[PDB]
Amino acid sequence: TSRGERSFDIYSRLLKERVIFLTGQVEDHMANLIVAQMLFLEAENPEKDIYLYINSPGGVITAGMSIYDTMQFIKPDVSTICMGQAASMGAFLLTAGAKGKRFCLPNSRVMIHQPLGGYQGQATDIEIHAREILKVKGRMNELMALHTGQSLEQIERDTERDRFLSAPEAVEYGLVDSILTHRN
Amino acid sequence: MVIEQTSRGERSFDIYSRLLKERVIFLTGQVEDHMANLIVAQMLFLEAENPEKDIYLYINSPGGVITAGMSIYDTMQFIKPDVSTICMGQAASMGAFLLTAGAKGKRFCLPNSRVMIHQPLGGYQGQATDIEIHAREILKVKGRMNELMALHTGQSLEQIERDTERDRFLSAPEAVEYGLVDSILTHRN
Amino acid sequence: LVPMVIEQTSRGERSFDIYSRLLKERVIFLTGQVEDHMANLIVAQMLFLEAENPEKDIYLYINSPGGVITAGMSIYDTMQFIKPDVSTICMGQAASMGAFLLTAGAKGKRFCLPNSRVMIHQPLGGYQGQATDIEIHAREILKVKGRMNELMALHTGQSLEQIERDTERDRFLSAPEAVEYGLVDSILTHRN
Amino acid sequence: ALVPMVIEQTSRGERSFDIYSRLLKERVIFLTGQVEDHMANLIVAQMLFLEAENPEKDIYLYINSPGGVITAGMSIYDTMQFIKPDVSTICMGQAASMGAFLLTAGAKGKRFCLPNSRVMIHQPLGGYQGQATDIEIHAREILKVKGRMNELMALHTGQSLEQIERDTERDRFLSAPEAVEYGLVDSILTHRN
Amino acid sequence: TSRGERSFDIYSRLLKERVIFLTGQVEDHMANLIVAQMLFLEAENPEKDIYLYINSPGGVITAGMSIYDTMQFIKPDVSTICMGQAASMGAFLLTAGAKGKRFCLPNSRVMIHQPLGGYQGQATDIEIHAREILKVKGRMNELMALHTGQSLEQIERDTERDRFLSAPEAVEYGLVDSILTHRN
Amino acid sequence: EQTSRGERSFDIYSRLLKERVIFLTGQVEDHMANLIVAQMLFLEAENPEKDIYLYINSPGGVITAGMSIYDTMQFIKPDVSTICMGQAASMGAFLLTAGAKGKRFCLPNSRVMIHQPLGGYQGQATDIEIHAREILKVKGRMNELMALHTGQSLEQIERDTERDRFLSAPEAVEYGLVDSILTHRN
Amino acid sequence: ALVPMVIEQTSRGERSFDIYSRLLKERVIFLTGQVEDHMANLIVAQMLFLEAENPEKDIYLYINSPGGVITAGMSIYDTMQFIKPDVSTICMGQAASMGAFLLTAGAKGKRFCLPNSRVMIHQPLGGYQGQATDIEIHAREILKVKGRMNELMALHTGQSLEQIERDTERDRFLSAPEAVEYGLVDSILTHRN
Amino acid sequence: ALVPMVIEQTSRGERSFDIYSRLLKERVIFLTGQVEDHMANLIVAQMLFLEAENPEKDIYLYINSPGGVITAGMSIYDTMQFIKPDVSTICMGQAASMGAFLLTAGAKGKRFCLPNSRVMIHQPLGGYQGQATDIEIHAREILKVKGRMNELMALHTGQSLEQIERDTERDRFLSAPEAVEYGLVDSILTHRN
Amino acid sequence: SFDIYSRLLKERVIFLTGQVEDHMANLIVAQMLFLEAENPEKDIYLYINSPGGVITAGMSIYDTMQFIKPDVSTICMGQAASMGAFLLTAGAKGKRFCLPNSRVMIHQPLGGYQGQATDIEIHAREILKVKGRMNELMALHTGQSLEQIERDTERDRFLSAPEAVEYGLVDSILTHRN
Amino acid sequence: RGERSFDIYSRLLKERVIFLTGQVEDHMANLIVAQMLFLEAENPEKDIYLYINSPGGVITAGMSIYDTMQFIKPDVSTICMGQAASMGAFLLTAGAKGKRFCLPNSRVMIHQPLGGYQGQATDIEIHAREILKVKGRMNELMALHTGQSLEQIERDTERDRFLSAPEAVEYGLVDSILTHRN
């Protein structure tokens, strides 16, 4: 079950330490739980850093954006740490952490790519939804350019097709600031 | 395995073969690749038996796949004989399109038949870059179809575009008045 | 479509199913639910018999629970269009679109067998989508309903008002009641 | 193993001869399995073909059925009474519900049961779903169908309408000898003679 | 979902600070839960504002209206905040918040359109139901005009087909009052 | 919104039950109906004189399950005030109109729908008659009860319920289904 | 079947043909629907038959297909080039992927598009599952197939290898007049001469 | 309907043959799709028929297959070597696994590949579930099957057994020219004489 | 009051049981981070009984084991196959054990993909990179040469408890409580 | 249906009683291992009682229980109720010498390992060789615990073999039968 004579379940005990976990595919409900944890911690102490551990293959864009906007809105800096993998929306939330406080573990990996979608209906409605996903794609490429330091042209260039990055390559690309190897 | 129902005469010769000798072809049900190829084959055959006599295409359809219907359209336009079209029951979407594509002066509607017109339907799934290529393509198809409908009915392109944004039904007399068909058939002479 | 009827091989003609053999007697069967393909087959048989001989009567036997309206209308219009009179006979039941096709037969040539039953009612339908489109389709089924009531009044001799009134909910009629109502001309009992 | 073909001896001329088509030439029609619209239509068509071939000679209808749809069965019943030829009925295996009704509807004096056949009679079955107003309209009709079937059964068997009503409230089985005594059939067929 | 973070009432904790979350598809039971939380907060203090966070693709209209009427009925002002997305009934409830207290986060999006439905039965019954959904459509356009300040004719025009709005466009249209970017 | 407890040992619904508020949400069926009856018997016990508030958002459901709620509403000492939010259709509308006279309300944008009983059965003709006859008796009792609570005549109710009929909040007040509309607290 | 039969007159059993078999007699072959092993084998058989009937007269192949399996399509490609007769190709409706490849593989100067037909081209699709070592062997192979297909498209259209590769990385649609200009087909067919 | 036909009923010598029966008259047999017992039996029957009609003339076997059941394929292999006629093999599309084995088993000097056909070779695949004792029995049998197939492949290709064993541990593709240098086929067919 | 697993966590014992996947792996990482904060010096004991699973999920556990201050002692009971065997050998040198009748199995990565040839090449390249990395780390922890690890992992290979010690996969066998 | 007094099983655990019920697999096996490690820490000198009613299951899962039983300090007494088949019969005979019991009407069943694989011939060989090594090790452990010769165990387990409580005592699978509360 995981409790330990220290608090309640194990995740609640680590939250006391200002640690939050983002695990698995991103969708509305698990995202709302992360938003709630961030707001709670800000109310507890708006000055202390918050740590967000990420191991995810990605997921729903609007759900991921509810997390991104919350991270930027709250007072505390949100430090991000990639373990296992950070793909697509996971890679986006990883690079969105506070500058100088984004990390990768030695054997983790990152993968980036463009938005995926679909629709069915009248030609007039298809045009409406196609234009919208193109706008979403442009905004995501711009936010990626701003957080990594890369040129808008390079981002577009690099997201057309899936692209994998090792921990050292992610530091050089500007996705994260450094690699964590041994405590202290 | 497939041989069933329609089969009266040595389990091969049917009623439809009988009428084909008289130059009559039936387009029934949803439009798709295999039923469409069958109609094309029948047109090429009749043209070969006699390139001067008319061919009659009866239509009772809810529509279907656009590329398959365009194989029939182009064949109707390519061959030598005139193709007379007759609507019975209903002629909707790709079905209304093929009805109005018949030989000018030889397009008919029976008294209580109905016609329905509208715009193309589609759907795609994949990367944003590919969604753009496919959405662009269906928009070109929509424009092409609107231009051909303008040519066959005599209406202006702008009028066709406004009337096909959403489903529009037409009674037999309304279809004559709109230029979809030439006249109504009521009682054989 | 199974029994291959032929002579005792005493030098005759080709082989043909039971239904094709009755088609030489100018008889056509309308059986089961009305739908596009079974309807198209009936139309082809009517056109064939008109070409064979434009003057002789055609007989249409009906045993159906009803079906798709546009498919039934392709049959109705063909019946009124061809030269020959189409006589109709109800065996088993004639419901909804089946009752409609039964009353549409040539005047004085519409019959019911003794224990047959007829049922009449209004159009059934359904749609799903945006409010604007729901409106377009609801308006259309109201027109369809109006035209159907108008044709029924014309063939039964009944007033439109009476037809509208009696088709709101299902209504059953025995053979005798169908004669009184004007749906059929008389009842067939023994070969005559 | 599907449909036996027999073309020899009594032929010389044309081919194509299924087992059932050959027996039709001898005026024999088979009614087998559940009664419903399409199989019933096939039986009606055969009766009409045989009347056209010869309006005076008897037709033989073999019956082995658990019953089925009432309207479909009435299409056969009315056709049997309408055509000119007498329709002799013969039960083999079983004739239940609508099957038993068609057996008893055969020409008087020409209705038979094979020795070990079984007959069963009961009342109509049905079901509906909808608003209370529509439920009363359909319940009322099935009660009328019930009354008409009991009246026709009384007429063909010679039993009083009261007795038919009491005997069909629940399922009732009859052996071949009991079917003759009840008036459902005229006699038992044992050996060809 | 995420397998761990709430555990010991993360949502009940935030309710104590008068915060309520409306997430995912709108339907009867999730809506009744939002209504109960609003009635509870009013009783605790009929004077203090309540904050309703919204991340929803829309849902059942009658369910959404139970939330709308409750929002207007209680004494306390209800502030609305869109995160991720607010589409259809989600967009409607976002615009229904208290005047001057409706917000959008920077990268959230809104989508508006007309009602959707479907029926099957006798022509007489089809007419009855078609008439009711057209009346529902008329009423919703009238409430959207009221809350946005746009003319009824402009609302009818813009809702015939799906229409997307970025955060800045939602402010300009009158759907929300402003955009929240950074705490302070 | 997900709220495991408007306290810690009390969920959101238990807390409001302390303020004498009960919620009837979704389809009406045996188990949810029994839960409502229990809450009513419990509240009566706590204080037989104070009013009970029943909020209703329902598409309707099983008739016998609904009548267990109706009969309990009339049997207990306290008056049961009814409030429609969202929609009250079929049996939902019936229970709304069954509240204490003068204390039946509709929120501004809620809607009501009324109609006749729906049913179904399968079997022998003798049994079909037995069940058809029963659903007809049920229909007549329901029409007689709607007349009593609304004030309309039996004849009028019978005509208005043959087919589905929708009423907006204002029309429900004129028809007599509810007493008035609620818009803003005090 | 739903296929019409061809017969001259009722001269007591004259001729019994099939619409498709009748047109095969005139050297016309139809390639319809998705491309796979069995439908492809049938096309190969009709071609081998036609060449055996007369090694000099042209063969006409009508194409309306969304494409399909590469190896199956290649069996048709190699057969078209191997036989003596020139194989004229005509696109009606659409010719996508493998369908487009086979349309352009027809005899130079004898490849046509009807006025409103459409063509679509792209690159090979595939997939595998297993150990890393085997994954390498299979990825390596689809890339060699990709390279070969591109070289053949370049030979039949006249476009440079570079242009083909560029134009096929992603789906690319072409109208009839645009296919003529690209070199995919030779000209359009509007009205019978 | 589906399969085309040629030569209908005519004066005296009627005989109506389908597309495949027609090519059989010219001693051509098609092997397509996955190899399994029933399709394999059909091929064996066609080979015995052709041997009976004329034991001295060559038979042509066209192959387009991804492979299949080994015992089914071996019934074809043993019949090929037993009958008196030489069996010429031609690969179109692909010849993988058992399909590649039957291709190389053709008469020496009479085995061909079309220009863009593809070949793939590998070791046997299998499975089993049961008691350890029975697992040993079945495991031993598939290893014996593996050895016998490698020995026969060495015999027909000319390669050493050691080379065959090393090249089949994992999937291995060969283009048509590589199949020739390997000894799998004798030459490439490009254009008809 | 307290379930059996929470009681053992009090003693610094963590269990890795069944297939390796994201959520169960996250639960393991959280337990390690909790134990480290309670005492960054004391050893942690990780029992393993697993057939393997998702590589990225397993690598989140591996990186955490190395990162934290305390030594992580590993004990194989039942079996440790594939990713399970990898995590067993990744334990602190001198503190890796096997029970007498446990079994170990090693092999190369497994994967799969579906799509356009261009994307297929991108994914095939990445799994070959993963294979090289894993082989490098196995060599480091076992003491065997890279070429030797490459040869022994091309196809499934089983090792009894004694063979795992001889191979350098674990340090010793535990038989009876000292 | 289940759960009495909120953990009747926790209460019995306080008396050093553990139950092994139903199919043997990874998760249920791990719970048994955890209970044994817990009791050893509570008191390493007192006996532990393991009740067994099982049709058998996964071998590697059962072996984790087997090795823990031998590793810990306390003696583990085993008691069969209902049935002990396959891996269940194995864990029963593995208890402390002199402390293995059968209730009067319980029954035991022994047999050889079962398995299955699918793939290339080379891989089939690797896996078939491994299950044969497993079969040999299991027969050697059964011979050590029962006192029977290895050859007798190999012969008796080729096919399913059932034993009543008294036959299990004679075979050396258990030490005695428990009939009435001592």
Swiss-Prot record, chain F:
One of its GO terms (biological process) is response to heat. It catalyses: Hydrolysis of proteins to small peptides in the presence of ATP and magnesium. alpha-casein is the usual test substrate. In the absence of ATP, only oligopeptides shorter than five residues are hydrolyzed (such as succinyl-Leu-Tyr-|-NHMec, and Leu-Tyr-Leu-|-Tyr-Trp, in which cleavage of the -Tyr-|-Leu- and -Tyr-|-Trp bonds also occurs). Keywords: Cytoplasm, Hydrolase, Protease, Serine protease, Stress response, Zymogen. It is found in: Cytoplasm. GO terms for cellular component: cytosol; endopeptidase Clp complex; HslUV protease complex; membrane. The active site is at S90, H115, D164. Disruption phenotype: Cells undergo an apoptotic-like death upon DNA damage characterized by membrane depolarization. Decreased persister cell formation upon antibiotic challenge probably due to increased levels of MazF toxin. Changing F105A: Little ClpA-ClpP or ClpX-ClpP complex forms. Its main location: cytoplasm. InterPro entries: ClpP, ClpP/crotonase-like_dom_sf, ClpP/TepA, ClpP_His_AS, ClpP_Ser_AS. Gene3D superfamilies: 2-enoyl-CoA Hydratase, Chain A, domain 1. GO terms for molecular function: ATP-dependent peptidase activity; ATPase binding; identical protein binding; serine-type endopeptidase activity; serine-type peptidase activity. Its EC number is 3.4.21.92. Induction: By heat shock. Part of the clpP-clpX operon. Inhibited by benzyloxycarbonyl leucyltyrosine chloromethylketone (Z-LY-CMK). It is an enzyme of class 3 (hydrolase). NCBIfam families: clpP, PRK00277.1, PRK12553.1. Fourteen ClpP subunits assemble into 2 heptameric rings which stack back to back to give a disk-like structure with a central cavity, resembling the structure of eukaryotic proteasomes. Component of the ClpAP and ClpXP complexes. The N-terminus (residues 17-34) interact with ClpA and ClpX. Cleaves peptides in various proteins in a process that requires ATP hydrolysis. Has a chymotrypsin-like activity. Plays a major role in the degradation of misfolded proteins. May play the role of a master protease which is attracted to different substrates by different specificity factors such as ClpA or ClpX. Participates in the final steps of RseA-sigma-E degradation, liberating sigma-E to induce the extracytoplasmic-stress response. Degrades antitoxin MazE. Acyldepsipeptide antibiotics bind in the ClpA or ClpX binding-sites, rendering the enzyme ATP-independent and indiscriminate, thus killing cells. Belongs to the peptidase S14 family. This is ATP-dependent Clp protease proteolytic subunit.
